[PDB]
Write a protein that binds this ligand. Structure first.
Ligand SMILES: Nc1ncnc2c1ncn2[C@@H]1O[C@H](COP(=O)(O)OP(=O)(O)CP(=O)(O)O)[C@@H](O)[C@H]1O
Length: 700
């Protein structure tokens, strides 16, 4: 159907045209006339090429202009908050103020109250609901994007709890990938179900093996080696997105391709890639990317920094980069389709042994094949090396996607959520906690939740014994200072426990390595991994600082190669964080501690929230003497700077490097910066014209 036919506020229709939309894809039409316009709940399960977002926006903005209030959009990761934030900007033109919310769990973020569209992660929104922000009752609609992640172990439970809290309290719209149980998820959400197999460009799915690609129609096409599929894509001026399981593999396979891909390029093309590779700050990770890019092939994974990944996604979408070998982790960032999508690996490293890539994911990767403007047909090829080609075809192509199961049974999120229900949503009887649970997706799918009730009761004993809660003088559960505080910090009740137990020791010896090692051993941070060749050196580093650690034993749980692992992962991480606050250059940190940019960025951001929560836990326990020290450690962790550089950090575009260049040149305070001519600041190596402009602009 056409835009204008949409019986919605005229201002929406206008924006859709100013964009470029005149008509809707069948799935969209079906969804837009499902009843979501009437404020009804709906589960839209259609391929991502089909425009799920647009449906949500129209629905959101509509609900908001016709009934006032706020529309909450839930994205999977912080990095995807920005993309959504940008593509939602045009709604400001019609009066709707848009905002992002992804961190700072320990805050009501009341400032958000003055906004009409809030883009937050499930975690951020969970925290906000815990803090009971006054603008929450204002929300008329919440869109759960990538809602199939509800069946995801690591974070699915959180997405479910926020949903269970919201059902019947606001409109709920789910945007998901094809699954095995849409009807079930829909009925739980008491929602209209929109299932469509429709997509913009035709998709051709095939399985490559021993030198041949068999498609779903039984036909065949010769290709010497799988990589011939790529060289073939480029010789036809098309793109190739190769999916791999490991970071090093992504890099190797990219370098290898590029060697042969350059010869299929042009003199102008080579030049564009050259200037491109010539625009990257030197590094062990950037060396590999550049050398590879100079051949039209780039790799993409979580180990690269935001700049570098954004640069690959963009120059790929722009056809400059001819191919991209990426890990499916931060994959989504590549909102960049491709003529041919090759799934190189179908067996990933499980957290137990070996497992095939879930069908749902294989479809999401394949469905990412075929660019609208350039292709009339996209080709998704699954490579089989061990498996039977006929079997691979049966599992993925002809077989339906796996069914989604609630992951509420996650002790981690469940411990955190049982305490929240008491510490922030006012639950005081076990009979009440099961009433909530009876309305969850877990209880929907199940005939009984008896096993869950048991977990919950044991969770209560853990919270009860660990002073997180108490059974009042009326035979009722009521939170304690430590409990509210913990639920509000959004840290896992278990990591808070770790903080309380070790508190005495931190008070006694408040040191960087000890604190960094402590938090790096918590369920709220994913430490740095290490290779066998880093162990030896790590062991020495360890003994050298054993006296400073609070958790001084790598084996209090056993000899499991995995326990000694977790502990040294935490220790290496603490050394990295030490060099970080110690102002060691990023290219140097990456080199010495054998770690990657994207990881440093992530660990640093999390460590800060953890050093902060450690400070807030110390407060609810009386350890007031380490509170100032911890706050100064928090601010140092946040920027990777020494104590004196702290006042300069409020300056725009001023990080570790520039703050030091300014301080070492005499400008130690904001007052020092103010009483200065631009000529002076520009003489300092590292402060360019754009920085001085932002700085003086900041100073009035
Ligand atoms: N009716 C329409 N007409 C033309 N283009 C449309 C459209 N609806 C959506 N699109 C476009 O199709 C593509 C949308 O990709 P986007 O990644 O934002 O959404 P999605 O459908 O993949 C769901 P999500 O992002 O939540 O997975 C974009 O290029 C967008 O501009």
């Amino acid at each position: 159907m056409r835009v204008d036919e949409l019986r919605v506020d005229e201002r929406i229709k206008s924006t859709l045209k100013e964009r470029g939309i005149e008509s809707f894809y069948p799935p969209q039409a079906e969804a837009l006339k499902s009843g979501i316009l009437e404020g009804k709940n709906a589960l839209i399960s259609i391929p991502t090429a089909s425009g799920k977002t647009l449906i949500a926006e129209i629905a959101m903005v509509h609900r908001i202009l016709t009934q006032g209030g706020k529309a909450v959009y839930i994205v999977p990761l912080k990095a995807l908050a920005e993309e959504k934030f940008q593509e939602f900007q045009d709604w400001e033109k019609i009066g709707l103020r848009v905002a992002m919310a992804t961190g700072d769990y320990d805050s009501k973020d009341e400032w958000l109250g003055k906004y009409d569209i809030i883009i937050a992660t499930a975690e951020k929104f969970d925290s906000l609901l815990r803090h009971g922000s006054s603008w929450i009752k204002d929300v008329k609609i919440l869109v759960a994007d990538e809602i199939h992640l509800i069946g995801s172990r690591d974070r699915g439970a959180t997405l479910e709890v926020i949903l269970a809290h919201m059902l019947g309290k606001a409109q709920i719209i789910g945007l998901s990938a094809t699954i095995g149980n849409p009807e079930e998820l829909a009925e739980w959400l008491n929602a209209e179900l929109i299932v469509s197999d429709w997509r913009p460009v035709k998709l051709r799915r095939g399985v490559f093996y021993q030198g041949f690609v068999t498609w779903e129609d039984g036909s065949i096409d010769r290709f010497s080696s799988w990589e011939e599929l790529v060289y073939d894509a480029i010789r036809k001026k098309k793109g190739a997105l190769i999916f791999v399981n490991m970071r090093r593999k992504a890099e190797r396979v990219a370098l290898e391709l590029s060697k042969k891909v350059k010869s299929l390029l042009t003199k102008p093309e080579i030049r564009a890639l050259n200037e491109l590779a010539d625009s990257l700050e030197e590094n062990p990770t950037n060396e590999k990317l550049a050398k590879a890019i100079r051949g039209g092939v780039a790799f993409h994974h979580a180990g690269l920094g935001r700049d570098e990944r954004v640069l690959v996604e963009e120059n790929f979408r722009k056809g400059i980069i001819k191919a991209v070998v990426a890990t499916p982790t931060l994959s989504a960032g590549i909102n960049t389709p491709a003529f041919r999508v090759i799934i190189r690996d179908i067996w990933r490293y499980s957290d137990f042994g070996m497992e095939r890539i879930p069908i749902i994911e294989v479809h999401q990767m394949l469905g990412r094949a075929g660019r609208p403007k350039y292709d009339e047909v996209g080709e998704g090829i699954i490579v089989s090396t061990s498996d039977d080609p006929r079997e691979v075809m049966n599992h993925y192509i002809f077989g339906k996607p796996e069914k989604l199961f609630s992951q509420l049974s996650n002790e981690s999120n469940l411990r955190s959520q049982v305490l929240a229900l008491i510490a922030t949503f006012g639950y005081s009887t076990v009979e009440e906690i099961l009433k909530f649970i009876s309305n969850t997706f877990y209880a929907y799918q199940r005939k009984d939740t008896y096993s869950l009730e048991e977990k919950i009761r044991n969770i209560l004993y853990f919270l009860l014994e660990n002073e997180f809660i108490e059974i009042s003088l009326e035979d009722k559960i009521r939170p304690l200072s430590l409990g509210i505080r913990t639920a509000k910090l959004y840290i896992d009740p278990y990591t808070a426990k770790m903080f309380k137990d070790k508190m005495e020791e931190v008070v006694k010896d408040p040191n960087p390595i000890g604190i960094f090692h402590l938090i790096s051993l918590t369920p709220d941070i994913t430490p740095f991994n290490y290779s066998k060749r880093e162990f030896e050196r790590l062991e020495e580093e360890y003994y050298e600082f054993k006296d400073r650690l609070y958790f001084d034993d790598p084996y209090i749980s056993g000899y499991d190669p995995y326990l000694e692992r977790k502990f040294f992962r935490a220790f290496k991480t603490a050394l990295v964080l030490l060099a970080w606050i110690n102002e060691v250059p990023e290219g140097e940190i990456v080199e010495k501690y054998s770690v990657e940019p994207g990881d440093i960025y992530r660990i640093v951001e999390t460590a800060e929230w953890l050093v902060y929560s450690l400070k807030e836990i110390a407060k609810v326990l009386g350890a007031y003497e380490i509170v100032d020290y911890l706050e100064t450690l928090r601010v140092r962790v946040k920027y990777g700077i020494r104590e004196e550089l702290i006042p300069l950090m409020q300056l725009p575009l001023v990080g570790r490097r520039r703050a030091r260049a300014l301080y070492n040149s005499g400008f130690r305070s904001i007052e020092d910066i103010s009483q200065a001519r631009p000529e002076e600041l520009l003489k300092i190596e590292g402060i360019g014209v754009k920085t001085v402009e932002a700085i003086f602009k900041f100073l009035g």
